[PDB]
Design a protein around this motif. Structure first.
Motif, mmCIF file in Angstrom:
data_model
loop_
_atom_site.group_PDB
_atom_site.id
_atom_site.type_symbol
_atom_site.label_atom_id
_atom_site.label_comp_id
_atom_site.label_asym_id
_atom_site.label_seq_id
_atom_site.Cartn_x
_atom_site.Cartn_y
_atom_site.Cartn_z
ATOM 1 N N UNK A 110 -3.667 -1.270 22.379
ATOM 2 C CA UNK A 110 -4.677 0.089 22.603
ATOM 3 C C UNK A 110 -4.122 1.415 21.753
ATOM 4 N N UNK A 111 -2.811 1.489 21.313
ATOM 5 C CA UNK A 111 -2.441 2.508 20.639
ATOM 6 C C UNK A 111 -3.211 2.706 19.383
ATOM 7 N N UNK A 112 -3.645 1.568 18.494
ATOM 8 C CA UNK A 112 -3.965 1.725 17.307
ATOM 9 C C UNK A 112 -5.664 1.867 17.571
ATOM 10 N N UNK A 113 -6.097 3.000 17.092
ATOM 11 C CA UNK A 113 -7.485 3.500 17.348
ATOM 12 C C UNK A 113 -8.430 3.324 16.243
ATOM 13 N N UNK A 114 -7.720 3.721 15.075
ATOM 14 C CA UNK A 114 -8.613 4.161 14.027
ATOM 15 C C UNK A 114 -7.727 4.043 12.666
ATOM 16 N N UNK A 115 -7.589 3.054 11.802
ATOM 17 C CA UNK A 115 -6.645 2.971 10.661
ATOM 18 C C UNK A 115 -7.254 3.767 9.322
ATOM 19 N N UNK A 116 -6.451 3.988 8.393
ATOM 20 C CA UNK A 116 -7.041 4.614 7.215
ATOM 21 C C UNK A 116 -6.565 3.540 5.996
ATOM 22 N N UNK A 117 -7.635 3.243 5.220
ATOM 23 C CA UNK A 117 -7.324 2.571 3.860
ATOM 24 C C UNK A 117 -7.659 3.214 2.763
ATOM 25 N N UNK A 118 -6.794 3.708 1.947
ATOM 26 C CA UNK A 118 -6.639 4.512 0.869
ATOM 27 C C UNK A 118 -6.261 3.809 -0.249
ATOM 28 N N UNK A 119 -7.291 3.413 -1.153
ATOM 29 C CA UNK A 119 -7.338 2.960 -2.271
ATOM 30 C C UNK A 119 -7.089 4.062 -3.518
ATOM 31 N N UNK A 120 -6.055 4.120 -4.266
ATOM 32 C CA UNK A 120 -5.747 5.120 -5.019
ATOM 33 C C UNK A 120 -5.504 4.615 -6.628
ATOM 34 N N UNK A 121 -6.439 4.781 -7.432
ATOM 35 C CA UNK A 121 -6.553 4.480 -8.641
ATOM 36 C C UNK A 121 -6.135 5.125 -9.952
ATOM 37 N N UNK A 122 -6.106 4.483 -10.936
ATOM 38 C CA UNK A 122 -5.497 5.203 -12.329
ATOM 39 C C UNK A 122 -6.470 4.340 -13.251
ATOM 40 N N UNK A 123 -7.137 4.973 -14.115
ATOM 41 C CA UNK A 123 -7.982 4.241 -15.206
ATOM 42 C C UNK A 123 -7.687 4.618 -16.433
ATOM 43 N N UNK A 124 -7.648 3.794 -17.350
ATOM 44 C CA UNK A 124 -7.344 4.150 -18.736
ATOM 45 C C UNK A 124 -7.951 2.717 -19.560
ATOM 46 N N UNK A 125 -8.281 3.068 -20.942
ATOM 47 C CA UNK A 125 -8.636 1.939 -21.867
ATOM 48 C C UNK A 125 -7.791 1.919 -23.193
ATOM 49 N N UNK A 126 -7.306 2.823 -23.605
ATOM 50 C CA UNK A 126 -6.518 2.672 -24.780
ATOM 51 C C UNK A 126 -5.173 2.404 -24.623
ATOM 52 N N UNK A 127 -4.503 1.438 -25.497
ATOM 53 C CA UNK A 127 -3.183 1.165 -25.346
ATOM 54 C C UNK A 127 -2.262 2.328 -25.128
#
Ligand code: HEM
Ligand code: HEM
Lengths: 353, 353
Positions: free
Chosen positions: A36-53
């Protein structure tokens, strides 16, 4: 048999299951347990985007910075790192963090070192793309399913432990029945995916708010410990069909109600691949996800194989977590990402409604 | 949208659907309509069985005699005739009658010309097998689904007419929701299929009683009015996969909970084939039928194709009717049939219980 729904979350029903009580599943599956202690979790997806080498060193470095930020007070209880290339040719590094409570994630996110990094003008001048897709389902608003008992990945890693064999699986509609809120609520989608600040067409800083009952699926594959024969069965017989399915959702999202589909591969801190992968799929509704999984030739193509190999399936680890959220429990924020990134693609701009 | 459940059969619910109220099916389907005068129907499958070619003249005469008895007072409102060869190589002529009420059917079967024929010594001396598989579902205990609106076959022929496009189809679990009794009842199977008289191993007269919530499916195909190209589509692409599925259920019944599986072709009074066919399948529970349909490769295969051809389907006619029955509302009778015929195969013998 045991129920997927935690004992403390079981309640008088206003909505019922689609199988009689005599139902027995044809193979074992397990779920994450938490008290019962766990009431609401957070899922944090943290991204880094790039295209050039030439951006790879900076991009890997930024990922290393984010990971180090997790070692600060109120950092997530668990995390993992992934890589994928999207359908625009952009490479995306995503660190997923899992917190056991909303307030701890909030203290962390607004703490000087974290907030100063995110709000810095340097985020605009880096040339890199940055994103935070942070969602917070209540205990009644997510379900898990594992074809194994130990070393739970994803949200199971922050829960209290593992269940015994559960009843609510092995039929279309079982996923819904594993959400404790399904006892009383339809988890009906309403509202729109809305841009509330900025413009995806201009780049810079864009803020997207989610709507009631967007569903997020993380469905994973782990072949890191499989022997040669099982590796070949996964890589030659399962992966092709999975890849076909992921490509479909990635490229035909709006047709089926999939706002964003990523098929990502786990990496170490230096960007070397690990033998674990997963889908990260954001959906316009839970029911749209149900419709796709139960009717599309790809997932159906995928699915029978498991039923066949389940008996002897020996070391391959397959699982998923599925969550729904209130509009207020979702934040999708982007800095200098291409307009097709995540929730940017389908979000309605300040004038489109 | 219109509900598959007839207005008069709609009631305050205790069991709920598995889709939210916003659900809209991806293609049109229709159902049989009847008013409150149709409380309970009788479905009577009357068979003649033989194996030797020299028995064909006598077998066909027997079928003609049965059909002639259908023209008497209190005979069925509708009937059709079919042929199949079982997995023991016996040929089976089956005439199915539908009565709009229980009392008419009882009056018919107890009438002298019908009763004296079934009780006759000629039945044992004929050398042919004979059977009567009679079941009586209430209006609340069957559902229909038609991919067309005109000229309903089977139980639809004794109903009042056709509905508009219905909401409750296009997802696994939709069949269950088309049963009016699903508003309140699980249709959970209990009890056993049992021999109450005779012995299947010896032949002669054998009588078998059903148990609570045995399910009966009639799933049919009609290609009589399809033109060359659409005929090719069904015969080359759909039929081979349908045949595969029917062979499976015919030869692997016990494993999946299918007591009897027949794949039959309609015939005229002379034995000549017509371009209509159907499955007659008796199942240990509705939920076992559900499991097979939503998970077996073969049904999942044809499911695939209907969804892709539905928009352009013009003359091919596909439908089904599914019934569940109270234990008391079934009677399965056999005279000189091989011990694998219909209910004989899986019934518990007198020496067993
Ligand atoms: C190749 C990897 C995969 C395999 C072998 C596979 C197989 C299966 C199996 C066997 C089930 C039934 C689980 C049970 O209740 O016993 C299932 C359910 C499901 N899968 Fe997958 N799956 C895979 C990947 C995915 C992915 C990437 C998605 C993302 C859309 C997905 C979406 C779903 C959903 C939404 C369900 C729930 C069905 C329901 O209970 O209504 N699966 N899958
Ligand atoms: C040409 C042959 C067949 C085709 C093309 C086919 C296709 C389909 C389709 C598209 C559906 C979904 C219908 C809807 O709700 O809109 C369905 C449902 C179903 N079919 Fe078939 N089918 C065929 C034959 C059969 C046979 C012989 C059986 C006997 C076991 C069978 C058993 C079922 C059952 C039980 C459902 C209900 C699923 C549910 O709603 O839970 N089908 N079929």
């Amino acid at each position: 048999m045991e129920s997927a729904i935690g004992e403390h979350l079981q309640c008088p029903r206003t909505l019922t299951r689609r199988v009689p009580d005599t139902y027995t599943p044809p193979f074992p599956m397990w779920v994450g347990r938490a008290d019962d202690a766990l009431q609401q979790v957070v899922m944090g997806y943290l991204g880094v985007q790039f295209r050039d080498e030439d951006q790879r060193p900076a991009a890997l470095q930024a990922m290393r910075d984010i990971v180090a930020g997790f070692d600060l007070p109120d950092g997530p209880a668990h995390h993992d790192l992934t890589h994928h290339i999207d359908n625009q040719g952009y490479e995306n590094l995503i660190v997923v963090g899992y917190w056991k409570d909303v307030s701890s994630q909030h203290r962390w996110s607004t703490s000087t070192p974290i907030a100063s990094w995110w709000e810095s003008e340097d985020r605009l001048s880096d040339g890199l793309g940055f994103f935070r897709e942070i969602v917070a389902p209540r205990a009644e608003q997510f379900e898990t399913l594992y074809a194994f008992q130990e070393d739970l990945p994803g949200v199971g890693a922050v829960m209290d432990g593992i269940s015994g064999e559960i009843n609510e699986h092995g039929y279309w509609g079982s996923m819904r029945e594993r959400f404790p809120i399904s006892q009383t609520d339809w988890m009906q989608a309403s509202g729109e995916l809305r841009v509330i600040a900025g413009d995806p067409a201009v780049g810079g800083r864009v803020v997207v708010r989610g709507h009631d009952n967007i569903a997020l699926i993380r469905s994973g594959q782990d072949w890191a410990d499989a022997e040669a024969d099982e590796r070949s069965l996964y890589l030659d017989e399962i992966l092709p069909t999975l890849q076909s399915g992921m490509d479909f959702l990635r490229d035909n999202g709006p047709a089926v109600g999939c706002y964003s589909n990523r098929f990502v591969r786990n990496i170490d801190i230096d960007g070397n691949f690990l033998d674990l992968s997963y889908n990260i799929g954001h959906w316009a509704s839970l029911d749209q996800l149900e419709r796709w999984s139960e009717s599309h030739p790809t997932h159906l193509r995928i699915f029978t194989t498991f039923f066949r190999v389940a008996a002897g399936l020996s070391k391959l680890r397959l699982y998923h977590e599925v969550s729904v959220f209130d509009a207020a429990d979702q934040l999708y924020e982007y800095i200098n990402c291409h307009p097709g990134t995540g929730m940017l693609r389908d979000a309605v701009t300040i004038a489109e409604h």
